Design a protein around this ligand. Structure first.
Ligand SMILES: *[C@@H]1O[C@H](CO)[C@@H](O)[C@H](O)[C@H]1NC(C)=O
Ligand SMILES: *[C@@H]1O[C@H](CO)[C@@H](O)[C@H](O)[C@H]1NC(C)=O
Ligand SMILES: *[C@@H]1O[C@H](CO)[C@@H](O)[C@H](O)[C@H]1NC(C)=O
Lengths: 319, 172, 172, 319, 172, 319
C-alpha cells in the first residue's frame, strides 16, 4: 500500500533544560533567562551626569577643596567614588547617612547666599594647613571660621539670621569647633564661656565647644562637627553665638530627583543603561541576573543561580 | 510524554525537515515526498513567542540604594536590610526556578499536542481508506498519487472518491 | 488547542445553546433537535467553581501602619520601607500575573478536554455503526429515531441491535 | 445516513483574557481579580470607634484644648485626621513617632492622678493665649506650668514622686520650658542655675532650660518640649526641679489593642469593613487591589495592575 | 479528568493489582489472568520521583536573628520587622499552597495520560483484529491463547497473523 | 470473542489532597511538605559551641561575675539564654542592641590590657555589695571604679590613653557613674563640677555625672551607664576625667564570625543541625515548616499551614 507518515523535526545538537519532572530534558532549542555578564563601565548615554571623582557628596555642601568644581549643578545621575573626601579639617557630620542619601537622591544643587555680615571685632577669614587650596592655607568654601580679630579677646555676642524667600525648602549647614587645647580656645574666642544657639520654627538646638585631648588627624587634635536642618519657605533661622560657630556663607537647595550610583567603573557615554551596580552596568533584556543583589535603577531581579534555560522548542529525539 | 506522540509512538524526529517543525513524508508510485505543515508549525511557534514576550521582561519599578558601597551601614538596620534582601532573593530564586520548570513542561507538552492534533486531523480525513501502523504512519489502501497526497496536506482530500477501491483492498 | 476540539476540529460554538456548555445536534427522519449534556457541562462548571473558591480570597493577616500619612518618616528607615514595599509589590504583581495566566491556560484546555471526552464517549458507544466526519459529527449508518437519538445522549445506546444493518450499509 | 453532531456553546460578546501563550484570548466569560473601586467612607459598623477630629493622638495624653472630649475612653478603632492639633503652645515631643504609634495601637486611655502638690511660693496655674479653653487663657489639661509666685524670685528646689500603685505600666509625660529670652527666664524661674532631673528604676535623665532667639509660632518664640517614659507596676518616678518643669497632674494608662487609621473620609455606621486606607474603605472579596500600597487591617494585596481578568469559561468561537 | 481514562471510561481501579500501577486483565478459553505493565508504571513513578527531588528541599541561604527572643526591640524598627516578616510569610504560604495545588493537578492528569497512552498503544497493535467496548477492554475477534495474550503485553503481537480470521468473525 | 482489559491500581483507603479545581481530591498516596515537629534540643555536633547560661553577651565585655567563665574564648556557635545577667550594679548600655548583635555575630573574644594607672590620691579598687564574687564584694572584672582615696577630697584631673597596637579593630567600653545624691557625689569625687571626655580619630564625646534622687535597684539608687566604641588599628583613644569615670582595665577584640542562637532548649552533642529556633533544632528535608517565623541558620520557610499534602499517585477509584 501507499503511505503517508507524520513526524516532527529534530536537531543534531539539542539543549538540556529542567522541567517539573526531569532535571535532564533534551529540547531542540532554549534560551537563557539569567544574565551572567556585566559591562565594566557606567553607561551614561542619554544621561546628564556628574562624576564626583575624589569629592564626597557632603563636601559639595560645605565646600571642601576636592569639591570646588561640584558646589552647584544639575544632573539626572550622580556618581560617588571610593575613598571620596568630605572633611579637610578633622571632624564629622551629625546624621551623616541621612544627609548623604538626600544629596544622592537629588537632581542638582543650587547655592543661595546667607548674607551674613560680621562686625569689626570678628575675623571671618580663619584658615588652616589642613584645607589647602593652590598651595595656601584655606577653608571650607561655603562656611567661615569666625574668630576674634584681636588674639585673646572675647568674641562678641553675635546674631545672624537667614530667611528663606524662595518657594522651596533650603538646606542649611553649620559647624561647631571643638579646640584641642585651652590656650587655643582662648586665642580664638577668649576666656569667656562659649555657647551656640540655633533656632527656627521647625528646629532648635544648643551647642558648647569642648576642649579635650584627642589624637592628631592630618596633624590636628581639634575637630569641627557639622550639623544641619531644612529651613521651610518663608521661615527664618537664627544663629546666636559668642565663639566657636563655623558659620555658613551660603545655603543649599536640592532640585528634583536623580539616581545616585556608588561605583568604581569608568564612564562610557557611548553605552546606554537603566541598571547599575558596583562593578558597572547591567544591559540586558533578561528578567533575572546573578551579578549582585546590590543594584540601583530599573533592574532584573537578583537570583542565586548560574543558569536557568527556558525551552523554545519540543523534545529533541534524534535519529 | 503527555499526548503520547513526540518521544512516544513517533519513534524519532526528522533532522532533514528544515522548513518546519511538523510535517509529512509519503511514498507512492510516483516517488518519495516530504513537506512541512505550516499551520501546526506556526501554532507552536506563536505559543512559544507568546511565552517569551511575557517572560523576557522587567518590572518598571526604579530602585534606589539602601546599602552604602563605600561606608558602614547602621548596625541594627543593616541586619534588617541583609535579612530582607536575602529573603527577597530566596523568593525570586524560587519563583524563577518554578516558572521555568513549569513553562518548560508546558512547552514540551504543547508541542506534543500539536503533533497529535495533526495526526488526528489526517486520521479523520482518511476515514475508512487507511489504517494506522502504530508508528505515526497511515497505510493508504488505494493508489494515492502526488495530487492525492497534496489534497491530504491541503485538507481537501475527499474519502468517498476512493472508498470503493480502498474497502476492497482492505478486506482483500 | 491542547485537546484539539474547541477552536480545533469543531469549527465553532453554538450561540443558540443557552441551556448548557456542551451538547448534541442531530438529524433523523423526524427532524432536527438540540440538547445540552448535563454531566460534561457540570464537570466544567464544578472545576471552574473550584478555582474561584481558591482564588477569590484574601489572607486573614492583620497589618498595621508603618508609613505615617500625615507626618514625615525618618530618612534612613523611610528608604528601607519604600524599598521593601516596592519589592513586595513587584512580587505580588508578578505572582498575580502568573496565577491568572496559568489558570486561564488550564481553564481553556480543561474545557477543551471535556468536549473531547464527550466526543470519545459517543464514538465508543456507536462502535462499528457510525463513522467520524472530522468536524465533530458522527454519520450513523442505520435509521436512528428520536428514541435512538435519546439513547445515544442518555448513554444507553446498544450497538449490537443495529450492527448487521450498519455493516451492510458501511461495506455496501 | 443519519447524523449526530457534538459541539459547545458560544456568546455574542466574549471577553478578552491573557494566558501563558496569548495576550488576547477571547473566552465566553471572565471575572476581575484586582479591585479598582473604593468606598469613599470609613465603614465603622460593628466597631466601638473614636473619631478624633482635630485632636492629635499625643494631645489626648497632655490634654490639648481640641482633645478635651478625648482625654479618656475605650475603643477598638482609633481614627486620626489631617492637620490634627497636638501642641497649642509651640514645641515638640522627643521620640514622638513611637508615642503616636503606641496610642494608635491601643484600645483606650485611662487617667490616674499623680497627686503632685506645691509650696505657696510656686504658682502652678500658669496659662497662655496659645492654649485657649472657654474663651480664656489656659494650659494643657493633664499638665501644670509651674512658675514663681513673685516675679523675679528663685523658684524653690522641689521634689515630686509618682508611685505606680497599679498592676499595669503607666505612661507619664512631662514638659521642659525653653524660654524665649533671659528676661522671661528670670521673671518666671529667677536668676539661679536651672536644672531638672527625672529618675525611676528603668529610666534616668536630666534637662536644662535653654534661652535662645527663635521665630514666632502663632505669636510665641518660647518652646515647651515634651518627654515621656513608662513607669512599671510598683515602681516610682522622682522629679527634682528648681524651675522649667511642666509637671504632670495625671499619668496615662493605655488599655488593650485597637486598629489605628489615618484617613480623611467621613464615618459610616451602615456598613462593616476590615480594610482601610487614606481615601476610605475596601469591601471587596477579590484577592488583589490597585488603590494604594498603604493599607491597614485584613486587606487584599496591592498590585501595579489596572485589571487581571480570570477566565470562567471556554474559548469563545462565535458564528 | 483531562485524558478521560482514570475516573473516566475506566470505571474503577483494581485493588488486586499490587505489582504495578497499570496493567492487563484477560479472558480466553484457557481462563483469566492479571499482569502489570512495567513501562507505563515506571514512567509515572519516574516523573513523581522527579517532582519529589525538586520540591523536597530548602535553600542554603544562612539567616541570622533580627528579633530578640528574650528582650525589647525598638518601637519603629520593630513595627517594620513585624510588617516585613508577616508580608514574607503571606508570600511563602501563598506560594506553598499554589505549588502543591498545581503539582497535584499535574500529577493526577499525568497519571491519567499514562493510562491512556498504554490503552492507545494496545489499540494500534491490535489494528483491525479487535474492537473497543468503551470500558477499557478490547474484544478480540480471534482465538488468543496465553502466548497470544503475552505477545499483546510484550508489544510483539503481529496483527496480520490473525487478520483473516478476525475479519471473518467481525464482518462475516 | 476473547478480551483483554486495560486498568490501573487502587487502594482501600486513599489520602485527601487539594488541587487547583478540587479541595477534596482522593489519591492513592501522598506526602507532607510542611514540617510540624522539632527536636527539643540544640543539636551541637560538629560545632565548637559556647552555652552562655546566665551570662548576657554584654557581660562578657564588662566582666559581670556571671560571665567569669566567658571573658575570653573561641566559638562558631554562641547560645544566649532567657533572663541572662548583664549588670550587677544597676544601669544600662547606650546602643546596647547593636552591641549585643555584634557579640552574637562573633567567633570569639580576646582581651588586651589598657595599661591605665592612677595616682596615690585615687582609689581604683572600689567594690560593691551588688557585684559579688568568691563570697565577697567586687566589681565588673574589666573595669575599675575610680574614687578619691580621702573622702570629700577632689578627684584629680586625669588623662589616660589606650593605643590599638593590633592590626584589627578593638572594642572598648567604659562607664559613667551617676550618684544618688550630692553628698555621695561629694564623698567620692569632691565638690568640683565633674566632666569626662573621650576622643579618638573616629569618635568624640563628653559626659557629665547626673546627681538625682532615684529608687533602689538591688538596694542601690546610684547608676552606672556604659558606653562603647571601636578603636581602629593603630589609633589612640584618650580619656580625660576628674571623677565619675568607670575606666577600662581591658579592651575586647571580637574574632571572626559565628552563629548566634537565642533558645530555651538544652544542648545535645550527639546530633547535627543547621536550623535553630527558641524550641530547639529543625532537621527536616521538607521545604516548609509551621514551628516559628523566628529561625536562624539554613531553614525551611515558615508558612501559616498545619499541613500541605503533595500527591505521589493517581486518583484513587476503589471497587
Ligand atoms: C533558539 O531560540 C532563540 C530565542 O527564541 C532564537 O533567537 C534562536 O534563533 C533559536 N535558535 C534556532 C536554531 O532556531
Ligand atoms: C494544494 O495547495 C497548493 C497551494 O494553494 C496548490 O498549489 C495545490 O494545487 C493544492 N493541491 C491540490 C491537490 O489541491
Ligand atoms: C506511599 O509511598 C511510600 C514510598 O513508596 C511508601 O513508603 C508508603 O507506604 C506509601 N503509602 C501507602 C499508604 O502505601
Amino acid at each position: 500500500p501507499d503511505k503517508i507518515c507524520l513526524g516532527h523535526h529534530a536537531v543534531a545538537n539539542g539543549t538540556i533544560v529542567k522541567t517539573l519532572t526531569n532535571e535532564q530534558e533534551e529540547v531542540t532549542n532554549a534560551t537563557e533567562t539569567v544574565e551572567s555578564t556585566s559591562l565594566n563601565r557606567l553607561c551614561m548615554k542619554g544621561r546628564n551626569h556628574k562624576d564626583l571623582g575624589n569629592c564626597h557628596p557632603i563636601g559639595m555642601l560645605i565646600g571642601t577643596p576636592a569639591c570646588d568644581l561640584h558646589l552647584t549643578g544639575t544632573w539626572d545621575t550622580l556618581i560617588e567614588r571610593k575613598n571620596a573626601i568630605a572633611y579637610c579639617y578633622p571632624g564629622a557630620t551629625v546624621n551623616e547617612k541621612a544627609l548623604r542619601q538626600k544629596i544622592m537622591e537629588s537632581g542638582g544643587i543650587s547655592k543661595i547666599n546667607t548674607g551674613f555680615t560680621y562686625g569689626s571685632s570678628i575675623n571671618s577669614a580663619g584658615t588652616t594647613k589642613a584645607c589647602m587650596r593652590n598651595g595656601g592655607n584655606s577653608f571650607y568654601a561655603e562656611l567661615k571660621w569666625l574668630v576674634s580679630k584681636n588674639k585673646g579677646q572675647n568674641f562678641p555676642q553675635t546674631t545672624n539670621t537667614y530667611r528663606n524667600a524662595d518657594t522651596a525648602e533650603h538646606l542649611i549647614m553649620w559647624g561647631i569647633h571643638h579646640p584641642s587645647s585651652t590656650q587655643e580656645k582662648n586665642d580664638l574666642y577668649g576666656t569667656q564661656s562659649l555657647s551656640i544657639s540655633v533656632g527656627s520654627s521647625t528646629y532648635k538646638n544648643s551647642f558648647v565647644p569642648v576642649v579635650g585631648a584627642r589624637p592628631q588627624v592630618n596633624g590636628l587634635s581639634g575637630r569641627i562637627d557639622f550639623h544641619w536642618t531644612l529651613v521651610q519657605p518663608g521661615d527664618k533661622i537664627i544663629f546666636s553665638h559668642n565663639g566657636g560657630l563655623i558659620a555658613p556663607s551660603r545655603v543649599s537647595k536640592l532640585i528634583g530627583r536623580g539616581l545616585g550610583i556608588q561605583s568604581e567603573a569608568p564612564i562610557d557615554n557611548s553605552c546606554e543603561s537603566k541598571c547599575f551596580w558596583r562593578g558597572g552596568s547591567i544591559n540586558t533584556r533578561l528578567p533575572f541576573q546573578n551579578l549582585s543583589p546590590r543594584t540601583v535603577g530599573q533592574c532584573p531581579k537578583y537570583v542565586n543561580k548560574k543558569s536557568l534555560m527556558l525551552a523554545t522548542g519540543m523534545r529533541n529525539v534524534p535519529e | 510524554g503527555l499526548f503520547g506522540a513526540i518521544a512516544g509512538f513517533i519513534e524519532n524526529g526528522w533532522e532533514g525537515m528544515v522548513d518546519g517543525w511538523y510535517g509529512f513524508r509519503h511514498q507512492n508510485a510516483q516517488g518519495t515526498g516530504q513537506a512541512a505543515d505550516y499551520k501546526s508549525t506556526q501554532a507552536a511557534i506563536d505559543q512559544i513567542t507568546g511565552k517569551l514576550n511575557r517572560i523576557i521582561k522587567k518590572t518598571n519599578t526604579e530602585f534606589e540604594s539602601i546599602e552604602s558601597e563605600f561606608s558602614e551601614i547602621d548596625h541594627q538596620i543593616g541586619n534588617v536590610i541583609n535579612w530582607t534582601k536575602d529573603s527577597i532573593t530566596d523568593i525570586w530564586t524560587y519563583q524563577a526556578e518554578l516558572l521555568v520548570a513549569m513553562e518548560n513542561q508546558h512547552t514540551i507538552d504543547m508541542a506534543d499536542s500539536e503533533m497529535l492534533n495533526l495526526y488526528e486531523r489526517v486520521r479523520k480525513q482518511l476515514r475508512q481508506n487507511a489504517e494506522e501502523d502504530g508508528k505515526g504512519c497511515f497505510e493508504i489502501y488505494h493508489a494515492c498519487d502526488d495530487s492525492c497526497m497534496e489534497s491530504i496536506r491541503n485538507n481537501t482530500y475527499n474519502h468517498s472518491q476512493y472508498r470503493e477501491e480502498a474497502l476492497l483492498n482492505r478486506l482483500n
